[PDB]
Every structure is written in structure tokens, then in C-alpha cells.
Amino acid sequence: MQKSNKINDALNQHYKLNVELGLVYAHYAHVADDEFDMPYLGKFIQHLSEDKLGVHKEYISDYFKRNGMKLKTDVSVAVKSIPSDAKALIQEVYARENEVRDHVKAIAKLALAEDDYESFYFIQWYVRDGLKDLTEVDDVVKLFNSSNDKLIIEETIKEMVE
Amino acid sequence: MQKSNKINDALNQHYKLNVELGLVYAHYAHVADDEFDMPYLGKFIQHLSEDKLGVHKEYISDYFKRNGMKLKTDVSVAVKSIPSDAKALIQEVYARENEVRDHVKAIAKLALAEDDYESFYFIQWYVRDGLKDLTEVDDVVKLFNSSNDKLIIEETIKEMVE
Amino acid sequence: MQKSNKINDALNQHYKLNVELGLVYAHYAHVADDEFDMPYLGKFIQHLSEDKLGVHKEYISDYFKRNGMKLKTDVSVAVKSIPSDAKALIQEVYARENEVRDHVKAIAKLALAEDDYESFYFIQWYVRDGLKDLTEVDDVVKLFNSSNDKLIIEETIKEMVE
Amino acid sequence: MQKSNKINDALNQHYKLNVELGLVYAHYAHVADDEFDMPYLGKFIQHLSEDKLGVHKEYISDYFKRNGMKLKTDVSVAVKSIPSDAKALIQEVYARENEVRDHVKAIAKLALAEDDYESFYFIQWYVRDGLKDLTEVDDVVKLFNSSNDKLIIEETIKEMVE
Amino acid sequence: MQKSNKINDALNQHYKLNVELGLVYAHYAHVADDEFDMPYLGKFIQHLSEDKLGVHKEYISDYFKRNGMKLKTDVSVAVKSIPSDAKALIQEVYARENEVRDHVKAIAKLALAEDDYESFYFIQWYVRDGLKDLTEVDDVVKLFNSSNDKLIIEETIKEMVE
Amino acid sequence: MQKSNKINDALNQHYKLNVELGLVYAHYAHVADDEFDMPYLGKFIQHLSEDKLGVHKEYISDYFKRNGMKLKTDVSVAVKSIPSDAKALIQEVYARENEVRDHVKAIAKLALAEDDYESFYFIQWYVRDGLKDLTEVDDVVKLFNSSNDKLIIEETIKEMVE
Ligand SMILES: [Fe+3]
Ligand SMILES: [Fe+3]
Ligand SMILES: [Fe+3]
Ligand SMILES: [Fe+3]
Ligand SMILES: [Fe+3]
Ligand SMILES: [Fe+3]
Ligand SMILES: [Fe+3]
Ligand SMILES: [Fe+3]
Ligand SMILES: [Fe+3]
Ligand SMILES: [Fe+3]
Ligand SMILES: [Fe+3]
Ligand SMILES: [Fe+3]
Ligand SMILES: [Fe+3]
Ligand SMILES: [Fe+3]
Ligand SMILES: [Fe+3]
Ligand SMILES: [Fe+3]
Ligand SMILES: [Fe+3]
Ligand SMILES: [Fe+3]
Ligand SMILES: [Fe+3]
Ligand SMILES: [Fe+3]
Ligand SMILES: [Fe+3]
Ligand SMILES: [Fe+3]
Ligand SMILES: [Fe+3]
Ligand SMILES: [Fe+3]
Ligand SMILES: [Fe+3]
Ligand SMILES: [Fe+3]
Ligand SMILES: [Fe+3]
Ligand SMILES: [Fe+3]
Ligand SMILES: [Fe+3]
Ligand SMILES: [Fe+3]
Ligand SMILES: [Fe+3]
Ligand SMILES: [Fe+3]
Ligand SMILES: [Fe+3]
Ligand SMILES: [Fe+3]
Ligand SMILES: [Fe+3]
Ligand SMILES: [Fe+3]
Ligand SMILES: [Fe+3]
Ligand SMILES: [Fe+3]
Ligand SMILES: [Fe+3]
Ligand SMILES: [Fe+3]
Ligand SMILES: [Fe+3]
Ligand SMILES: [Fe+3]
Ligand SMILES: [Fe+3]
Ligand SMILES: [Fe+3]
Ligand SMILES: [Fe+3]
Ligand SMILES: [Fe+3]
Ligand SMILES: [Fe+3]
Ligand SMILES: [Fe+3]
Ligand SMILES: [Fe+3]
Ligand SMILES: [Fe+3]
Ligand SMILES: [Fe+3]
């Protein structure tokens, strides 16, 4: 029993990702209410933000405390352009959640390659939240192709959030 | 009724500060438990982190949604050195909370100078949380000069957090 | 301790304003249900009317009873033209609530200039209700640009009122 | 089935009256507490004010919404002289409530003359509130001829309001 | 962030004032029951005494603990003459509560002049208690001009205290 | 049945003492938290302060109201030096509570000498509170000789106060 430097770096990068995405989603939530007049779209994405800045980063920090791995905090993120409309906004959220699934798959593959079975298990939670969080977002992108009425979409989002 | 660009920038900078401090405190919380074997010191500072990354940044974003001001997300923070022991760790937290009070005082002074009375009011919450958050931290720094026993200090912190 | 005649006049004018607006909103509420077939738009604006004719005017009268200021009742208001459709109706409500914020800012500025700190405090409630009432109205004007279906808008207004 | 222009005007005038009286009573309530040191006399007259500015004007507006009549809002009222003492103050309230009964009797007489039976019924509520509101006021004017002690009168008013 | 010696002295003087007034009101409460046979007048003024010797002085001491200011305890007060009757007794209470409002206004003016925004906020509580406490007293002085019967006045005071 | 001037003076002096001590303890409570970082020591001494400024002075004032004795309010107290550390602080409290017992014994001795049996009884409460209050303080001074750890002492004080 030891501590894989390779897994430590991949998990430090995943920590980095969840902080930076969460800050982007926090901004996107502001825009969804403010500029696009879709307050419940904003609540959906703000909950995504609090999830990414919350248990997604805390589980890695907690995991490090126990296996002997070192936490690194290096965060750089700037929101320099915003998508043009609400549909693109949530389409962009979806693209980044698809990238999460990819990164999560790389960590499982590497944990097995390092015979780090504690780290393969730890990541099983992330293997699923990736699909769960992606479906939630997908359920929302669906709405924008089923209605042209923002208040219809908003009402349907409200019950997803409630 | 309008929108002071000067106040917008000062509040965007305060948003920036509360995100960046919160990420630093999140790291400092990890270290307080992991390296210094003080789990409740870590819980105190993690609650500080969640407060700074939470209502401190959300109130500014919510305030902007109503007065017409623009949110900017530009975050750069790297935790490159850690203090040597728990006392210095919480001493460093204190220094940064003292800097918050200074920044908050500049925004009140400027709001009056701009006759932005909605913004002077908004900041009244921050004028006080600055003193309240500073006292909480001060109560903890006190302990390290009243006992040389980490488990005594930890037990006293626990009831502050409970 | 005394009684600023200047503040007394500005507060008597604000009393005047809240009575006259409330009578206009009472009419606009009637029209929103009667002519535009939007009963919940009418309930939103009738609640605005009862608020302006209620605690907005009573707090000034109560404040005068305590600091020694004289109440004046001079009310002249006639609703001679109505906006063309519901969107313009609530757009017009918004314009007048923006003018409230302006007037409220003048009273805070003057209270400080007169070192009337009891009157600066009294007005802090109005500094915020101005923004709160303006956001409520803004949330409604939003709907008319997000849907072309009056019954969709009405249903969304209903839950704001409920 | 139609819409009597004559009844519409008489009911628009009654709307006008109840708004203007209510604004006068709102002032008289202020004076009864402030200048005459009779806070419960003020509460009695403030409740009269809220009643006149409330269901008295709302029932006409609601009635118009259903029979097809047009609401007019033309309000002019200025409180330029105040009675000399509390007795005269409530004596003056009484005189105006006696004038309400007269106006209400004219509308019933006219509704029958126009065979407007929906409007004769609507006014039956007002035929009685006129007598009820007049008795409440009369019960108060009674007190001022039964005691010369303002605090005795105030205590008796309090239980009428409670 | 620092500590204004000028504000410290003005707040130490306000501490001094609230202790000394409270001791005077404690005596005046004794006299109101003992000599003037008005036990509930005494309870009104004794509650004023406990308020001045209580949260009025404790909030300053608590405020000092947090901003770094020094408490001074220098108290000199002697009750060498008593007013002639109950009316004058409560008239004298009123005069001193009017002087509190004046002193409180000086501290707000000075806090702004020193850009001490934490101290301007702290004093906002006192800006209002000054008016609230003055109205309570004013409500009592009112009674002595509305009745010549001490037991009527006493009964009315009792429900204010209850 | 009469009124002993000698007892009146001794009880007026005891009133004086309990006011002045209470103001000193109020200061000492501030110092115990602020300078010595012992918040619960401060709560112990603040409760002592509220007791001395409360029922200790009120029972004398109430006793005077019934036997015909005259209350005098002559208070002079200045806290010009503070003890060096917490141990001395509570040691000083103890010394003054020992002086209370002495003064209380003089009043009992004098009441018997004057055959003032109502006053001998009144003082029986004080004969015991003197010993009770002295033991509470003694229990605290004990702690400072049983531990050298301020946070241990503080924790033990907390349960005495709770
Ligand atoms: Fe990654
Ligand atoms: Fe979730
Ligand atoms: Fe990056
Ligand atoms: Fe293998
Ligand atoms: Fe998730
Ligand atoms: Fe629907
Ligand atoms: Fe539902
Ligand atoms: Fe539904
Ligand atoms: Fe439903
Ligand atoms: Fe800042
Ligand atoms: Fe907190
Ligand atoms: Fe930076
Ligand atoms: Fe200015
Ligand atoms: Fe905070
Ligand atoms: Fe506990
Ligand atoms: Fe414990
Ligand atoms: Fe416990
Ligand atoms: Fe105005
Ligand atoms: Fe409202
Ligand atoms: Fe006008
Ligand atoms: Fe000035
Ligand atoms: Fe409002
Ligand atoms: Fe519902
Ligand atoms: Fe619904
Ligand atoms: Fe529903
Ligand atoms: Fe009429
Ligand atoms: Fe009624
Ligand atoms: Fe008229
Ligand atoms: Fe006929
Ligand atoms: Fe009525
Ligand atoms: Fe009675
Ligand atoms: Fe009763
Ligand atoms: Fe009764
Ligand atoms: Fe009763
Ligand atoms: Fe003062
Ligand atoms: Fe009070
Ligand atoms: Fe003095
Ligand atoms: Fe300045
Ligand atoms: Fe008070
Ligand atoms: Fe009662
Ligand atoms: Fe009663
Ligand atoms: Fe009663
Ligand atoms: Fe003594
Ligand atoms: Fe006790
Ligand atoms: Fe002395
Ligand atoms: Fe003897
Ligand atoms: Fe005691
Ligand atoms: Fe312990
Ligand atoms: Fe316990
Ligand atoms: Fe315990
Ligand atoms: Fe315990």
C-alpha cells in the first residue's frame, strides 16, 4: 500500500475541473435569469454549480486525507464569451458534462492499470454521476426542441427543480 | 436611476475576492485536518470557505440582476505555500478577513460618494459580516495562546462549530 | 433635535406620490382584468395598489407622529388615458416604479445633507422596497417578451401572486 | 340587458366619494392621535378610512367588470382645515357619513326608476353599511357627551375597536 | 482597518450617559411609586432604567471587544433634587431622552466623517431606540394632559407596561 | 413603629456599594473576555454584575417604600487600574465579596441594637447571599490553582454558568 503519483495528478486535475466548471456554471446561471429571462433555467444550472463546487471537489479532498495524497489548488478560469441564447447555453453545459464523462473514464482505466483498487472504487461514484448529471442536462436540452415558448419551457423546468 | 460603473467594478472585485479566498480556505481546511491533525479547525475553516463561495458571492450576483449591473468572472488563485503550523494557519485566515473589512469600507465610502443609496444599503450586510466573521476567527486564534495542547483546542473549537 | 422643514416637504410629497400612484394602479388593475382579459395581471397590480395606499403612506404618517412633522393631504389624480395593451400597461407600471427609486434616492441624499439621521434610517426601508417592487414588476414585464400567449402569461403570474 | 349611463355616473361618483372620504379620514386619524392625544380615536377613524378606500370602492369596480360599465378615476381632495378638538373631529365624521346615506338613497331610487334590478340589489349592501357605519360613529360621538375625561373615552373606544 | 480614538471617546461617553441616566431613572421609579402613589408610572420608568443599564451599555462594551476599542468606566451621578409631581417627573424623563437623540446624532455624523462604517452601522440601532424610547415616554406624558385623575392615568399606564 | 435613621444610612450605603461594585464587575467582565481571552470568566462576572445592580439594589429600594425610609442616590466609581491577569482579577472579586459579608454583618448587629426586627429580617437574605456569592467566586479562584491551562479553566467555568 502506497500512493500512485499518476492517480494523484489525475484526481488533482479533476478537482481543478470541478472548481472551474462550477464557477462557469455560476456565471451561466446568472445569465440564464438576467439576460435570457429564464429564472428556473438559472436555478437548474446554479444547482449544477453548487454540486460541482461541493461534493465533487470535497470527495477528492476527503479521499486524499485518507490514502496519503497531496491536494493542489491551481485555479484559472475566465468567462470571456457567453452563448447567444438559452438553447445554446444549455447545449454548452451539455458539452462540458460530456467531457466530464471522458475524464472520469480515463481515471478508472488508469486505476486498474496501476492496480489501485481503492482508487477504482472511489471513482465508481463519478462514473455514474457523470451519466446522471448528463441526463438531467439532456432532459433540459430536450425541452428547447419540443417548444418554442420560453414560459412553457420554464414551467417544465420548474417541476424538474422542485 | 442608473448604474455606477465604479460600484460595478468594486463589487465585481469583491465577487472575485470571495471566490478566491473561499478556494484558499477550502485548501487550508484540508491541511488543518490532514497535516496538522486538527479536524475541527478544518471544519471551522471549511464553513468559512462555504460561506465565502456561497452567500457572499450570490448576493452580489443577485444584486446585479436587479440594478442592471454586469457580472464578470475572472478567477486566478494558486495555493503555493502553506503556513508552518495551525496557529499560523488561523493567523493567516485572520489577516485576510481583516483585509475584507478594509475592502468593504471602500465600497461604502464610494457608494455615498456616488449617491448610490441602494448600493450603500446592500453593502451594510457586508459591513457587519466582516466584523462577525473576524470575531469568529479571532475567537479561534485566542485558543492557541491560551493552551499548548492541540486536543484541548480542538475540543473547544468543536463546541464553537456545534 | 428638531424637525427639518425640507425633509417634511419631501416626505409629504412622497406621501402624495404613493396615494396617487395607488389610485392609478387601482384603475390599471380594473382594466387588466376587464378590457385585457388578464385577471391575474389585475391581481398583481391591485396588490401593488394596496401596498402603495397602505404601508407606504402609513409609515410616513407614523414617522411624522414621532418626530414632530406635519402631515399634508393634497391629492389630485385623474386617469385620462389607458395604455393600449397589457404589455404597455405593465411597462407603464415599471416606469413609475423607476421614478419612485429616483425620488427615494433624493430623500436619502437630503437627509444626510441635513444630518437628519433618524430620517436617513427611516428611508432605508424605502431604498429597498423600491428595488424589490421594481423587480416584481420586472419579473412580470419579462413574461410578455417570453410568450405570445396571454393564458401562458396569466398562469405564470398566478404562481407569483399565490 | 344593457348598461344605464345614469347609474354608471352615479356609481362613478360614489366611487369618487369613497376614495376622497377615505383620504380625509386617513388624515383625521393622524390628527386624532398626534394633536388630540387620542390614539384609539385614531384607530377607529383609520379603520373607517381603510373600509372606505377598500371594499367600498372595490365592490363598484367589481360590479362594473360584470355589467359592462366603465370605471372613471377623477380624484381631487385637499385637507385645508382641521376641526378644533376631538369632539368636533368625530362630529364632522358623522356629518359626512350622514351624507353617504343620502347619496346611497339616490342610487336606489334611480335604479328602480331605470328598472335596473341588478343595480338595485348591488346597492342594498350600501343601504345598510350606511346605517351600520353611521351607528358606529354615533356610538363614539355619544362618549364625548357622557364624559369630560379623554382617557375614559379612549378606554371605551378601545373595546369598540378590539 | 484601525480604531478611531474620536469614536471611542464618543462611545465611552455614551456608555457613561446610559449608566448615569439608568441610575437616575432607578431613583425616579422609586419616587413615582413611593411619594406620588403611582406604582405603574414607577414600573414604566424602572423598565427604562433596566434598559439603559442593560443592552444600551452592553452593546457598546460588546462592540469594543470586536473592533479593538478600550472601555472606560468613569461614573459620577447624584440625585440631589426630585421634581415636584408626577407630571414633571415624566416631563423630566422626556427631556433627557431628547438629549439622548441629540448625542446619538452626533455619533452618526462623526462616524461618517471618520469613514468608520462599522461604527455608523452600530449606531443605527441607537438612532431608532432614541425615537422609540422617546415615543413611549411621550405616550405617557400625553396622559397627564388628558386626565386629572391619577388612577385613570395609572390604569392606562398599566396596559402600556403589560 | 418608626424608622431608624441609622439603619436608613447603613442601607443607603449598602445600596451605594451594590451599584458601584456592579459597575466595576461590568468592567471586569469586559476585561476578562477582551484582554485575558476568557469569555466564560467574563460571563461569570457579568452575572455577578447584573445581580449586584439588580435584586441587591432593588430589595433595598422596595424595603424603603414600605417602612418609610428615604432612598439616596450618590454614586461615584472609576475603574482606574485593572489587575494583571485572570487569577488576580477573580482574586480581586473575592476580596470585595468578603468586604460585602463584613458590611452585611454590621447591619444585622445594628438592627438588633436598634430593636429594628423588620430590618434584621430583611437583612437575613443578605447574610446568606454573602456567603453564597462568596462560595461561587471561591469555586472559580480554586480553578486557577488546580490548572495552568486557561482553556481547561474556561471549560470548567462554562458548566458552572450553564
Ligand atoms: Fe479531469
Ligand atoms: Fe444533482
Ligand atoms: Fe483552465
Ligand atoms: Fe494489471
Ligand atoms: Fe453531480
Ligand atoms: Fe401550463
Ligand atoms: Fe407541482
Ligand atoms: Fe403543474
Ligand atoms: Fe403542479
Ligand atoms: Fe474587494
Ligand atoms: Fe457564519
Ligand atoms: Fe488574484
Ligand atoms: Fe454627496
Ligand atoms: Fe460571512
Ligand atoms: Fe456539547
Ligand atoms: Fe463539553
Ligand atoms: Fe458538552
Ligand atoms: Fe417623492
Ligand atoms: Fe409586496
Ligand atoms: Fe399630481
Ligand atoms: Fe455633513
Ligand atoms: Fe412596496
Ligand atoms: Fe401551484
Ligand atoms: Fe403549476
Ligand atoms: Fe402547481
Ligand atoms: Fe355619491
Ligand atoms: Fe366596519
Ligand atoms: Fe371633490
Ligand atoms: Fe317603473
Ligand atoms: Fe362601511
Ligand atoms: Fe376604567
Ligand atoms: Fe377587554
Ligand atoms: Fe375593560
Ligand atoms: Fe377588559
Ligand atoms: Fe453621549
Ligand atoms: Fe423598551
Ligand atoms: Fe456626570
Ligand atoms: Fe468623507
Ligand atoms: Fe431603549
Ligand atoms: Fe388588559
Ligand atoms: Fe382594561
Ligand atoms: Fe383589560
Ligand atoms: Fe455597606
Ligand atoms: Fe447568583
Ligand atoms: Fe466610592
Ligand atoms: Fe436590646
Ligand atoms: Fe448575590
Ligand atoms: Fe475536557
Ligand atoms: Fe454540559
Ligand atoms: Fe463536559
Ligand atoms: Fe457536558
Give the chain E residue nearest B137 (alpha carbons). Answer: E66
CA quadruple E110, E115, E119, E125: dihedral, nearest 10: 70
CA E147 to chain centre: 26
Place of cell 350622514: D98
Nearest chain C residue to D78 by CA: give it. C74
Q: CB-CB: which of A34, A53, A74 is closest to B78?
A: A74
Buried b (16+ CB within 10 A) or exposed e, F83-110: beebbebbeebbebbeebeeebeebbeb
Q: How remote is the CA of residue E53 from the centroid of ligand 39, in Å?
A: 10
Q: How far apart, in whole angstroms, are the C-alpha atoms of residue D93 and residue D31?
A: 13
Asked if E69 and E3 touch (Cβ cutoff 8 Å), the reply is yes
CA B110 to ligand 38 centroid distance, Å = 9
Question: Can you tell me the distance from the alpha carbon of F53 to that of F27, in angstroms, rounded to the nearest whole number?
Answer: 13
The cell for A128 is 455514474
Contact between F75 and F16 (Cβ < 8 Å): yes
Residues from chain E that touch D149, judged by Cβ atoms under 8 A, are 146-149, 152
Interface contact flag, E131 C1, Cβ < 8 Å: no
- The DSSP output letter for B68 is T
Nearest CA in chain B to C96: B1
D19: nearest CB among C23, C73, C74: C23
Q: Is the Cα dihedral D50, D56, D57, D61 positive or negative?
A: positive
Contact F152 B153 (CB under 8 A): no
Residue F33: which of E57, E65, E73 has the nearest Cβ?
A: E65
Tell me which chain C residues have a C-beta less than 8 angstroms from the C-beta of D74: 78-79
Angle at B75 between CA B72 and CA B79, to 5 degrees: 165
Q: Cβ of B156 and F151 within 8 Å?
A: yes
8 A C-beta contact, residue B39 and residue B74: no
Give the whole-angstrom CA distance, residue C119 versus residue C7.
8
Question: Within 10 Å of residue E108's Cβ, how many Cβ atoms?
Answer: 24
Q: How many C-beta atoms surround the C-beta of residue C123 within 10 A?
A: 28
C-alpha cell at A18: 470541478
Residue D16, C-alpha cell as written in the block: 369618487
Of A37, A38, A149, the CB nearest to C152: A149
Rg (CA), chain E: 17
The end-to-end CA distance of chain F, in Å, is: 45
| CB A57, CB A11: distance < 8 Å | no
Distance CA D37, CA D86 (A): 9
Identify from B142, B145, B153, B154 which residue to disrupt to test chain F contact, counting F C-beta atoms within 10 A and taking the largest count.
B142
Beta strands B74-78 and A74-78 are antiparallel
From the list A19, A33, A78, which residue is nearest B23 (CB)?
A19
List of residues 6+ apart from B71 with CB closer than 8 A: A27, A30, A31, A34, B12, B15, B60, B61, B64
CA atoms within 13 A on the CB side of F12: 17
Describe the crossing of helices C150-161 and C117-146 by its angle, rounded to 10 degrees.
Answer: 150
Phi/psi for B50 (5° steps) reads: -65, -35
- Beta partners for residue E75, in sequence order: F77
Measure F97 CA to ligand 10 centroid, in angstroms.
51
Grid coordinates representing B29 are: 481546511
Q: ∠B6-B12-B13 over CA atoms, to 5°?
A: 90
Count the helices and strands in chain C (H runs, E runs): 6, 1
How far apart are the CA of A158 and the centre of ligand 24, in A? 9
Residues in chain F: 162
The C-alpha of D143 sits at a distance from chain C's nearest C-alpha, in angstroms, of: 25
Contacts of A9 (CB under 8 A, 6+ apart): none
Cell 350600501 -> residue: D126
Task: Measure CB to CB from residue B74 to each of A19, A26, A78 and give the nearest one.
Answer: A78
Is D75's CB within 8 Å of C77's CB?
Answer: yes
CA distance B76 to B90: 22
Residues 6+ apart with CB under 8 A from A36: A85, A86, A89, A150
Contact criterion met (CB < 8 Å) for C109 and B118: no
The answer to whether E156 and D154 have CB atoms below 8 angstroms apart is: yes
What is the torsion angle, in degrees rounded to the nearest 10, for the CA atoms of residue F88, residue F94, residue F95 and residue F101? 180
CB atoms within 10 A of CB E103: 16
Rounded to whole angstroms, how far apart are CA atoms E54 and E44? 15
Sign, CA dihedral F117-F123-F128-F131, equals: negative
The H-assigned helical ranges of F35-78 are 39-51, 57-67
Binning chain F into helix, strand and coil, the percentages to the nearest 5 are: 80, 5, 15
Resolution of the entry in angstroms: 2.7
What's the alpha-carbon Rg for chain C, to the nearest Å?
Answer: 17
What residue has cell string 421594481? C134
Mutate which: E24, E25, E27, E30, vs F, most F CBs within 10 A = E30
Alpha carbon separation from E152 to B125, D39, D54, E158 (Å, rounded)? 46, 16, 36, 10
E strand or H helix at A76, and its extent? strand A74-78
Chain D touching partners, 3 or more CB pairs below 8 A: C, E
Which residues in chain B are contacts of F38 at CB distance < 8 A?
Answer: 146
- Cα–Cα distances (Å) from C110 to A37, C12, C103, C116, E107, in that order, read 36, 14, 11, 8, 18
- CA C159 to chain D, closest CA, distance in angstroms equals 22
Supply angle C-alpha A107, A111, A113, rounded to 5.
Answer: 115
Interface of E with D (CB under 8 A): 139, 142-143, 145-149, 152-153, 155-156
Please answer whether residues F150 and F37 qualify as being in contact, where contact means their C-beta atoms are separated by less than 8 angstroms. yes
Residues of chain A with Cβ-Cβ distance to B17 below 8 Å are none
Q: What does the alpha-carbon distance between residue E53 and residue E62 come to, in Å, rounded to a whole number? A: 14
Which SS3 state, helix, strand or coil, does residue E48 take? Answer: helix
Residue A120 · residue A108 · CB < 8 Å: yes
DSSP state of E70: P
Distance from CA of C90 to the nearest CA of A (A): 16
- Nearest-Cα distance to chain B for E144, in Å, is 41
Q: A61 CA distance to ligand 4 centroid (A)?
A: 26
Q: Which residue of E has its CA nearest to C66?
A: E135
* Torsion angles phi and psi, residue C74, rounded to 5: -130, 105
Rounded to the nearest angstrom, the distance between the alpha carbon of E116 and the centre of ligand 38 is: 10
**Which amino acid belongs to residue A82?**
I
Amino acid letter, D151: L
Residues 6+ apart with CB under 8 A from B15: B57, B60, B61, B71, B72
How far, in Å, CA of C66 to CA of C64, rounded?
Answer: 5
Q: Please tell me which of the candidates B34, B75, B77 has its beta carbon nearest to residue A65.
A: B34
D102 vs D17: CA distance, rounded Å: 12
Q: Identify the three-state secondary structure at position F77.
A: strand
Instruction: Name residue D76's beta-bridge partners.
Output: C76
Residues 6+ apart with CB under 8 A from C92: C28, C83
Cβ within 8 Å of residue E42, ≥6 positions away: E29, E30, E31, E32, E33
Task: Name every residue whose Cβ is closer than 8 Å to that of residue F128 and which is 6 or more positions away in sequence.
Answer: none
Task: Report the alpha-carbon angle A52-A55-A57, nearest 5.
Answer: 65
The residue assigned the cell 343601504 is D127
CA–CA separation, F162 vs F155, rounded Å? Answer: 11
* CB contact set of A44 (below 8 Å; sequence gap of 6+): A136, A140, A157, A160, A161
Residue E147 DSSP label: -
Residues A122, E157: Cα–Cα separation, whole Å: 70
The gap between the terminal CA atoms of chain C, to the nearest Å, is 45
Opening angle at CA E72, ends E66 and E76, nearest 5: 145
Residue D78: list chain C partners with CB under 8 A. 73-75
As to burial, measured by CB atoms within 10 angstroms (0-12 exposed, 13-18 middle, 19+ buried), residue D73 is: buried
CA D116 – ligand 29 centroid, Å: 10
If one counts every other C-beta atom within 10 angstroms of the C-beta of residue B68, the result is: 11
Angle between helices E5-34 and E117-146 (to 10 degrees): 20
| Residue B86 φ/ψ, nearest 5 degrees | -65, -40
Separation between Cα atoms, residue B127 and residue B110, nearest integer Å: 13
Which positions in chain F have a beta carbon within 8 angstroms of at least one beta carbon in chain B?
37-39, 149-152, 154-155
At residue F155, what is the residue type? E
> Which residues in A lie closer than 8 A to residue B65 (C-beta atoms)?
30, 33-34
Among candidates B66, B59, B77, which has minimal Cα distance to B122? B59
Please state, in angstroms and rounded to a whole number, the distance separating the CA atoms of residues B53 and B19: 5
Measure the CA–CA gap between F107 and A100, rounded to whole angstroms.
Answer: 84
Residue carrying C-alpha cell 361618483: D13
Angle at F120 between CA F119 and CA F123, to 5 degrees: 85
Q: How far is the CA of F21 from the centre of ligand 45 (A)?
A: 9
**Separation of alpha carbons D52 and D25, rounded Å:** 9
> Which ligand is closest to the CA of B46, given by its number?
11
Taking the C-alpha atoms of residue C154 and residue D6, their distance in angstroms, rounded to an integer, is 34
User: Which of B17, B19, B24 should we substitute to test contact with A (largest number of A Cβ atoms within 10 Å)?
Assistant: B19
- What secondary structure does DSSP assign to C71-99, as a single string? P--EEEEE-----SSHHHHHHHHHHHHHH
**Residue owning grid cell 427611516:** C122
Give, to the nearest 10 degrees, the angle between helix A57-67 and helix A117-146: 180
Give the chain A residue nearest B55 (alpha carbons).
A50
Q: What is the DSSP string of A33-53?
A: HHTT--HHHHHHHHHHHHHII
Tell me the C-alpha to C-alpha distance, in Å, between residue B89 and each of B34, B92, B96, B140, D150: 13, 5, 11, 11, 69
Which H/E stretch holds residue B77?
A: strand B74-78
Contacts of C51 (CB under 8 A, 6+ apart): C22, C133
Give the one of E142, E145, E152 whose C-beta lies nearest to D152's C-beta.
E152
Collect all residues with Cβ–Cβ distance below 8 Å to D155 and sequence separation of at least 6: E155, E156
Backbone angle region of B4, left / alpha / beta, with phi > 0 → left and psi within -120 to 50 → alpha:
beta
- Cα distance between residue D25 and residue D45, in whole Å: 6
Q: What is the DSSP string of chain D?
A: ----HHHHHHHHHHHHHHHHHHHHHHHHHHHHHHTT--HHHHHHHHHHHHHIIIIIHHHHHHHHHHHTPPP--EEEEE-----SSHHHHHHHHHHHHHHHHHHHHHHHHHHHHTT-HHHHHHHHHHHHHHHHHHHHHHHHHHHHHH-S-HHHHHHHHHHHH-
Alpha-carbon distance D104 to D127, whole Å? 6
Nearest by CB: A150 against C139, C146, C155: C146
Burial (CB count within 10 angstroms: exposed 0-12, middle 13-18, buried 19+), residue C58: middle
Adjacent-strand bridge partners of C77: D75
Which SS3 state, helix, strand or coil, does residue E77 take? Answer: strand
Q: Tell me the angle at which helices F117-146 and F57-67 cross, rounded to the nearest 10 degrees.
A: 180
Q: How many CB pairs under 8 A join C and D?
A: 57
Residue type, B91: Q
Q: Which residues of chain B lie closer than 8 angstroms to F150, CB-CB?
A: 146-147
The answer to whether D75 and D20 are in contact (CB under 8 A) is: yes
Question: What is the spatial distance between Cα E147 and Cα E141, in angstroms, rounded to a whole number?
Answer: 11
Cα–Cα distance measured from residue C116 to residue D8, given in angstroms and rounded to the nearest whole number: 49
Quick check: helix, strand or coil at residue A26?
helix
CB contact under 8 A, C33 and D65: yes
Ligand 17 centroid – CA A117 distance (Å): 40
Which helix (H) or strand (E) covers residue C159, if one does?
A: helix C150-161
Interface of B with C (CB under 8 A): 1, 65-67, 112, 115, 117-118, 121
Tell me the one-letter amino acid at D62.
D
Which of B65, B48, B54, B81 lies closest to B161 in space, CA to CA?
B48
Please, which residues bridge with residue C75 across strands?
D77
* Dihedral (Cα; E52, E53, E59, E62), 10-degree rounding: 170
Q: What is the dihedral of CA D60, D64, D65, D66, to 10 degrees?
A: 110
